Amino acid sequence: DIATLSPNEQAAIDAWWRAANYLSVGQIYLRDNPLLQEPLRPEHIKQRLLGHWGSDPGLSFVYVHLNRLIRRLDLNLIYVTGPGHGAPALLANAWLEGTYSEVYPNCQQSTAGLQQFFKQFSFPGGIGSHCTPETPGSIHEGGELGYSLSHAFGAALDNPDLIVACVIGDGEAETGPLATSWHSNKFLNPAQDGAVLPILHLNGYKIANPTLLSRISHEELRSLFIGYGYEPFFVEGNDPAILHGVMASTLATCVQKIQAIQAAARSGESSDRPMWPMIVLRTPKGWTGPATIKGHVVEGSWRSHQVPMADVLTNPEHLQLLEDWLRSYRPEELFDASGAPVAELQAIAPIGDRRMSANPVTNGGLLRRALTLPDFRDQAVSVPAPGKSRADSTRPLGQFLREVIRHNPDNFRLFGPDETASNRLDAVYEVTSKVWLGDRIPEDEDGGHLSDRGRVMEILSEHTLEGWLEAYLLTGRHGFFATYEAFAHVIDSMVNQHAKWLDVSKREVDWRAPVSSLNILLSSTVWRQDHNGFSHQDPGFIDLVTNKSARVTRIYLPPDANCLLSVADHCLRSTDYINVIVADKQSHLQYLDAEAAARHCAKGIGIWDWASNDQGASPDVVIASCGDVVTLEALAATALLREHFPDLKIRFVNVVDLFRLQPDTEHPHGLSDRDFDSLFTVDKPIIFNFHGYPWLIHKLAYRRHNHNNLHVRGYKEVGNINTPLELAIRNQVDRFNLAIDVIDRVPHLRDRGAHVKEWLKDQIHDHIQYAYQEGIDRPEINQWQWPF
Amino acid sequence: DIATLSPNEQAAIDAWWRAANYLSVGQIYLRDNPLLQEPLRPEHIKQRLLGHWGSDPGLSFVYVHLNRLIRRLDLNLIYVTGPGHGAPALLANAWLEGTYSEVYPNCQQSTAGLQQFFKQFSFPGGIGSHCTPETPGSIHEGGELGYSLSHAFGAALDNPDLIVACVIGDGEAETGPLATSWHSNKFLNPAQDGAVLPILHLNGYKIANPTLLSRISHEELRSLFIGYGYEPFFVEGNDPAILHGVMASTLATCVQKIQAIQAAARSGESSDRPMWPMIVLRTPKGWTGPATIKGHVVEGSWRSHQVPMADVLTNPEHLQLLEDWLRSYRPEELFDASGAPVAELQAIAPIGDRRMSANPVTNGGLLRRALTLPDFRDQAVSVPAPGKSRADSTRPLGQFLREVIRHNPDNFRLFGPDETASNRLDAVYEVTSKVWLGDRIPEDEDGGHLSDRGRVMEILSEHTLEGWLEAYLLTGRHGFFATYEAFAHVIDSMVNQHAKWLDVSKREVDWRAPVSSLNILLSSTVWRQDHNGFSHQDPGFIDLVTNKSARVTRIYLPPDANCLLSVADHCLRSTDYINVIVADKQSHLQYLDAEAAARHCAKGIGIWDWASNDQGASPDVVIASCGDVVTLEALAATALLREHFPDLKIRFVNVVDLFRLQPDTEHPHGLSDRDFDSLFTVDKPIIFNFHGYPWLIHKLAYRRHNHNNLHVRGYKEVGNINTPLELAIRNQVDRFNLAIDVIDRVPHLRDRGAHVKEWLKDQIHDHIQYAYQEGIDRPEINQWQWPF
Numbered sequence A, B: 001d002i003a004t005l006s007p008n009e010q011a012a013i014d015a016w017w018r019a020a021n022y023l024s025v026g027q028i029y030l031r032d033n034p035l036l037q038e039p040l041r042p043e044h045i046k047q048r049l050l051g052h053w054g055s056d057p058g059l060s061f062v063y064v065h066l067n068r069l070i071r072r073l074d075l076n077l078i079y080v081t082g083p084g085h086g087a088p089a090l091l092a093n094a095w096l097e098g099t100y101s102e103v104y105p106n107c108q109q110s111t112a113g114l115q116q117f118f119k120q121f122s123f124p125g126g127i128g129s130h131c132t133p134e135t136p137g138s139i140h141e142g143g144e145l146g147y148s149l150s151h152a153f154g155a156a157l158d159n160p161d162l163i164v165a166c167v168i169g170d171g172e173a174e175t176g177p178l179a180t181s182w183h184s185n186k187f188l189n190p191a192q193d194g195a196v197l198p199i200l201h202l203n204g205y206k207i208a209n210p211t212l213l214s215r216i217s218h219e220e221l222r223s224l225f226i227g228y229g230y231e232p233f234f235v236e237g238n239d240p241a242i243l244h245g246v247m248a249s250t251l252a253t254c255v256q257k258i259q260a261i262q263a264a265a266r267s268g269e270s271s272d273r274p275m276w277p278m279i280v281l282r283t284p285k286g287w288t289g290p291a292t293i294k295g296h297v298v299e300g301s302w303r304s305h306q307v308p309m310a311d312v313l314t315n316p317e318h319l320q321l322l323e324d325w326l327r328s329y330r331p332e333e334l335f336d337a338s339g340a341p342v343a344e345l346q347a348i349a350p351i352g353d354r355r356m357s358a359n360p361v362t363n364g365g366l367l368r369r370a371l372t373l374p375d376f377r378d379q380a381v382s383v384p385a386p387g388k389s390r391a392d393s394t395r396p397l398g399q400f401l402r403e404v405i406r407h408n409p410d411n412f413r414l415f416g417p418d419e420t421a422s423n424r425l426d427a428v429y430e431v432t433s434k435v436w437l438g439d440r441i442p443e444d445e446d447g448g449h450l451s452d453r454g455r456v457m458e459i460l461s462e463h464t465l466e467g468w469l470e471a472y473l474l475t476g477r478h479g480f481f482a483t484y485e486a487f488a489h490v491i492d493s494m495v496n497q498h499a500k501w502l503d504v505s506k507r508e509v510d511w512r513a514p515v516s517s518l519n520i521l522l523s524s525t526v527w528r529q530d531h532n533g534f535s536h537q538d539p540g541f542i543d544l545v546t547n548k549s550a551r552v553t554r555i556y557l558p559p560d561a562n563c564l565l566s567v568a569d570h571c572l573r574s575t576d577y578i579n580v581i582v583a584d585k586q587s588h589l590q591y592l593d594a595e596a597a598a599r600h601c602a603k604g605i606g607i608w609d610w611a612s613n614d615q616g617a618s619p620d621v622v623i624a625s626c627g628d629v630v631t632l633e634a635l636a637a638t639a640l641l642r643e644h645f646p647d648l649k650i651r652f653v654n655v656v657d658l659f660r661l662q663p664d665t666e667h668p669h670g671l672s673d674r675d676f677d678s679l680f681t682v683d684k685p686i687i688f689n690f691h692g693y694p695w696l697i698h699k700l701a702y703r704r705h706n707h708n709n710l711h712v713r714g715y716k717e718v719g720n721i722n723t724p725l726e727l728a729i730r731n732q733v734d735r736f737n738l739a740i741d742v743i744d745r746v747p748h749l750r751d752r753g754a755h756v757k758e759w760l761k762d763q764i765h766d767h768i769q770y771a772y773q774e775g776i777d778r779p780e781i782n783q784w785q786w787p788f
C-alpha cells in the first residue's frame, strides 16, 4: 500500500506543502509581521525583490513527497537542486524539519525566529538567493545551470545505500553539459554504488520563452529519454488532489525498481545495464500562486519566474492581491500561537539524521577520512647525475596512482577523457580497469582495459567528467583529474563554480567541514604540439585560475618525474585548494633526486646548485624557469653561456609553486621580501622563462622591489605546424634566444658578447633551415644533456 | 534510377575512392617518390608523423558519393568536417577535383606537383594536420570537437538552395555542445533556408576507447535520434561492393526527402516541423588499411586512429608492410605517366563552380555584401545637459537593431539566450519575432513573440547559439550576439577557435576574402547583481579576450546609450575583428549627445570637458573610468572633490576602446606616446576606475612612461548578496573610495584633506549601516545627478 496514500495523511502532506510555500513567499516578500497577525503594510515588505518564485512550487512539491517515502522505507536522500534559484523552497523545508534551527540558533522555531528567517533572505548581511554553502543539505550551487545532474552522480560514486534525487528544469536540460550528463547512468555501477533518481520539472516555460523540451511531442520526448537509457514516467496535471496520489504512486513505483536493480546487481544474477527510472512533471510554473494580475497570465507561464508582481509598495492593489495570496494557504491552521509548526507537521517530519537537509553526505568533510598513500620514493626514478639521465615522467606518476588505488579501494577514483592511455598512464591499468558497463567484444578485451568494476572513469565530455569529481570531493572522498592542457578552457566555467564554493565554505560558513582538494593534471603542453588537439593550443587556463584568489587555487609546474611525484603526493593531502599540475607527457631529462625533489617542493622555489655557475659570489644574471620544456631550454642556455663566457656567474632558480612569487602581504604562503631578495638578487637582471603567457609572472611579482629588472619570455603565438625547437624560436624561449637576452641585460656583456651574439643568431638561422629541409630537429638537439 | 548505381560507374567511384586514400597515405608518409616508380626507401618517408588515419577512409567514402549525387541533381554542397583531422581526405579530393591546383599553382597536377603535395603536408612551412583556413572549401577548423554541427546549421541560415553535409564522429558526439546541437533542426526554417544533412560516422572506436554511441543498442540509438527529431537511416558493413550500393541508395533516398520537405514548405501546404533525414555509418575505422601489424588488430579498432604504425624508418619490416599498403590501391592504373589522374577520374569530377571544395559559400568574403545601416542619430536619445538626464540605454540599441532588420531582411540575424526580453530589447519585436517552428498555444501568442518566420534565434545553450553565428559570418552574412556577462565563460573555448580562424585568414592565407566581424554584446554586468545569474559573477571574459592579439579582438565599454549606438554602428562596419561590447541593462545617466558620442567613439578615448574641472592649467589628478557603472562612481567622486576642494583641478578621461591604451609599437591602432601623454599627464597621478579585473589595465599600459603613476581600482570579489552601492564599497570603486584615493595620491592634499578623508569614511560607514537596516540604498544615492 506504499503506492496509494491514505486521505488523512494527504492532508498532512498538503499541510506541509502549503506551509513550505507560505514560508517561501514570506522570505521573498515579508520583512516583518511573519504570521500576518496584523493587516499587511508596506513597511513589512522588502524594498528590492531578488527572490525567484517559478521553481518554488515544484521543489516543495517533490520534497514533501520524498519525506513521505523516506519515513516508510527508511532511505537516505540528498536532493541536489537543478534550477538553484529554488533555495526558498529548500530553506523552508529545512526550517520546517528543524534542521535550520539547529544549524542556525538565531532562526529558532518561533514567531521571533520567523521574523528573522524572512528578514535574512536576499538581504545584505544575510543568506543569498541561490543555493549557497550556507544552505543546509546542499552540495550544488545551482547558479550556473547544466551541472546539477553530474553532481548527482558524483555524490553516489561510492556510496552504495545512498539515494540521490536530482530535479532538472526543462530550461536547464537543453544545455550542453546537461544534454550529455544523461549518459552517465551507463558508467554508474549498480552493484557497489547508490542510485540516482532524476526528476524533470517540465514546467513548459523559461524566463521569457517556452522550453524546448516541452514543445516536443510526448512520443518524441519518450523516444529521447529512452535513448538516454532511462525508464520514463510521466506525471501531469494541475489538480493537487489528483497530483498527490499520482506523484506518490510514481515515486513508490520507481524506488522499488531502484531497490530491485540494486538487489539484482549485488546478487549478480542480472549483470547488465538497466533502464533507470525517471519522473517527468508537467505541472504549470507557479501553479499555487496568482493567476492573473495585470491583465496577463502569471500562473503557468514565463511571467511566473522570479516575479509574481513587479511593484508592491507603489501599488496598493498589488499589495492587496499579495495579502490574498498569503491568505490562500490558510497560515492560521499551520502554525500555533508561538509560531512553531503544529503537531501535524512535526509528526510527518523525518527524525534525527535521516533528515535530507541534515544528511552527513552533504557536509562531506565530516564523512571524509584521510587518504592512506604509500611513500612516493619507492616509485621515484634514480638519477646518478642531474640533467644527464633521460626518462619519461609519466610512468612514475602512473605507478604511484596505482599504489594509491590499491591502498584506497573505495574513497579514491581517477578521471580522464580518453587520455589516460594517451598520457602513458597505463600503470594503473595493471590492477584496475576503466568502468564501461556496456556490451563488449573479444576485440575490446585484448585492446582496451574495460570491466564492470573499476576505479577509472572514461568519457570525452569534460563537463560531465569534472561534475563527477566536484561532487565526489564535496561528498568527502578523494579524486584525481588528468587531461590535456589544450582542452582546459572547456572546464573553465566549472572551475570558477567550484572555487566559489570553497571560498565561501572556508571563510563565511563555520559549520562546513573541509573537503578534499581538487587535483587537476594538465598534460601535453603547448610546446610539444602532439598529434592530438588543435594546432593553436592555448595555455590561457593558467591565467584564469590566477584570477581566483591565491587562498583557493594552487598551480604547480614540476620539471621532472621526481618533482612530479612530490607535487602529486603533497596535493593529495591538501583539503581546501584547487591544485593545477602542469606536466608534459614527452620523455625529458631528469634533474632532481627523490630526496632532492621533496626538499624542492617543500620550498616550492629554490636555487639549483649544480646548474648554478658560481657560489660565494654575486651572480651576474639570474636565470629562472617555471615549466619543464622551458626548463630544458633554460638549462641549455646556461650551458652555452658558461661555455662561451667562463667568467660569467649564473644563478639558476627553478619555481614549482607559482604563487610563491606573490608578496607576503598578499598571502602568507608567498615568499617574504627578504626571502625573495635572497633567491632573486635586488639588482641583477632576472631572465624568467615561463611556460604560458609571459605577463602572468608580472602580475604576481608586481609589488616586488626588483620587478623592473624582471624579464619574462613565454608563450606568444604558434604557427600552423612547427618542430619543438623552432616553436621555441617563434616565442623566443629557445636556448639561443635566452642566451641572446642574457647578453643584452648583463652590462659587461653588451660589448664583449657581440661576437657570441652573432654566433647565436647563426645557430638560430641554421637550425630553422635544417628544420625546413628535413622536418625534424638535429640529432644533437633532441639528445642534448647537461655538459658538466 | 538515382538510388541504384551502374556497375561501370561504381568502378570509377571506387577508382576515385582508391585514389583519395592513396593520396591520403602519401601526404601522411611520403616525402619523395610520389608514384612509387622506384622501390620505397627510408629517405622518402617523413621523419615525424603527425597525421591521423582513422577518419580518412570514411571522409573519402562520403565525399566521392556526394560528387556522384551533385552531378545528377546539380546540387551545391559544403561538406563541413566534424573530426577535423580528416584533412588529408579533404585535400586529396580537392587535389583530384583540380581545385587545389587552381588555388595553389605550385601543387600542379603532375608528378612534380604530387611530390610537392605530399611534401607540404604536416611539415614546417606547410599546411597543417587539421583543416585550416589554407584548406580550400573549409569553414570549420575542426581541431576542437563538438562545434561542427552548429557550423553546419549556421552556414545554411539564410541560403535557401544550399545543402550542407556535416560528418559527425561518434567520439565527438560525447561532447556537450554536440549533444545539444542536434535540436537545431527545430530552429531551422525549411521555407527560406537550406537543408543540412548530418552523417554520423559510428566507427566504434576513439583514439583509445570504444565510443559510447556504438556500445548502445541499435534500438536505443534509433530512439535517441528520433527524439532529436531526425529520420534515422542506417548503413552498415565493411564490403565495398555492398557498401557502394547501399550508401548511394540511402543518399538518394535522403536528398529527395530534403527536396520534398523544401518544396512542401515553400508551397505552404505542409507548415509543420518534419523529421529531417540522417545517415548512420557503421563502417570500421580504417577498414581499407592494414589489419594486423604487431600482433594486434589495427583495422576497425582504436589503433587505426592517428598513425597505423609507430616506427617505419627503424623497422624495415613495417616499411615493407607500408609499401604493400600503397600497392593495395593499385596506383599504376589511377595515374598516367605525367602523374595527373586518368580520364576516368576527370570525367566523374564536378565541373566549374559546382565543385564542393570550390564553392563560393566556403570563401564567404566574396559572397559578402556591405550592410545597409540607417543613421543612428535618429534613434539616439536627446540630452540637454550631460549627466543630468536619466534614461535606459537598452531601448535606443533595440530600436537601432530593429531598423537594421528591416533594411537588411536577409543577411542579418540576432542571437540571445532567452535574454532579449530580459535585456529590454523588445523594440526589435515590433517588426519581427523569434523563430520556434513548434506547437503553439494562444497563451504563447499573447506572452511570447513566436512565429515560423523570424530573424531572432533564442536558445539558452550558448554553445550551439554561438556556433550558429560563427558560420553565419564565415558564410558572408552579418550578425549580432547579445547575452549576459556572467555566462560569457561558456563561449570561452569557441571564441578562441574563431579568433584563430581570423588570425590565420588575415595574414597567412591570401586568397581568403575578409568576412564580417563577430559582434558580442555583454549585458547585466557584475556590479548591478541582477536576479538572474549566480551571485559571484566574473568579468574575467574580458581578460581572456585580451590574451589574444589586439589585431583580432576589440573590446568596447560605452558609458551611455548614445555611445552604445555609435559603437554598435561602427562595429557593424568592421570586417576581421571580434567585437566585445560591454553595456549595462539598468537605467543610468546619459553623458554624451548624439554628435558628441560619434566624436568620442572616433577617438575611442577622450577628455570630457564638462566633467573636467580646470582647462588651461595643469591638472592635479587625472580621473579615468572605463565601464558605465564605474563611470557614474568616477563622476560622483569628481563632484565630491570639487565640492570640498574648490582649488583642486581634475581632468576626467573616459575610455571606450580598451586597446587604445597599448603603445603604438604593439599595434598601430593604439595611441602614440605623445597622444597618451596628452590625455594622461606624464607626472600627475592617474586614478583609473575599470570595469573588470584591475590588472588588465596594467597589462595594456605596461610599456607607457607614466605606468608607475597609474592606479587602477576594479573588480576584486563579491559578497553573497549586496546592494549596488555596497558592492562598490567592497571593491573600493565607490565614489567615496575613489575620493579617498585621490586625496592620498595628490601631494598637496595628504595634509589638507585629512578632515575630508575622515568625513568620507563616515559616509562609507553610514551608507553601509543604512543598507543593513533597510536593504536598499539611500534615495539620494540612486537619484544622484551631476550638479554642475
Ligand SMILES: Cc1ncc(C[n+]2csc(CCOP(=O)(O)OP(=O)(O)O)c2C)c(N)n1
Pocket (backbone or CB within 6 Å): A054, A055, A083, A085, A143, A144, A145, A168, A169, A170, A171, A172, A173, A175, A201, A203, A205, A206, A207, A211, A285, A305, B417, B418, B460, B461, B462, B487, B490, B532, B533, B534
Ligand atoms: C547557461 C545559462 N543560460 C542562462 C542562464 C540564466 N538563467 C538562470 S536561471 C534560468 C531559468 C532556467 O529555467 P528552467 O530550467 O526551466 O527552470 P524553472 O525555473 O522553470 O524550474 C536561466 C535562464 C544561466 N544561469 N545559465
Ligand SMILES: Cc1ncc(C[n+]2csc(CCOP(=O)(O)OP(=O)(O)O)c2C)c(N)n1
Pocket (backbone or CB within 6 Å): A417, A418, A460, A461, A462, A487, A490, A532, A533, A534, B054, B055, B083, B085, B143, B144, B145, B146, B168, B169, B170, B171, B172, B173, B175, B201, B202, B203, B204, B205, B206, B207, B211, B285, B305
Ligand atoms: C572535447 C574534446 N575532447 C577530446 C579531444 C581530443 N580528440 C581529438 S580527436 C579525438 C578522437 C575522437 O574522434 P571521433 O569523434 O571518435 O572521430 P572518428 O575517429 O570516428 O572520425 C579526440 C579524443 C578534443 N579535441 N576535444
Ligand SMILES: [Mg+2]
Pocket (backbone or CB within 6 Å): A169, A170, A171, A203, A204, A205, A206, A207, A211, A285
Ligand atoms: Mg522552466
Ligand SMILES: [Mg+2]
Pocket (backbone or CB within 6 Å): B169, B170, B171, B203, B204, B205, B206, B207, B211, B285
Ligand atoms: Mg571514432
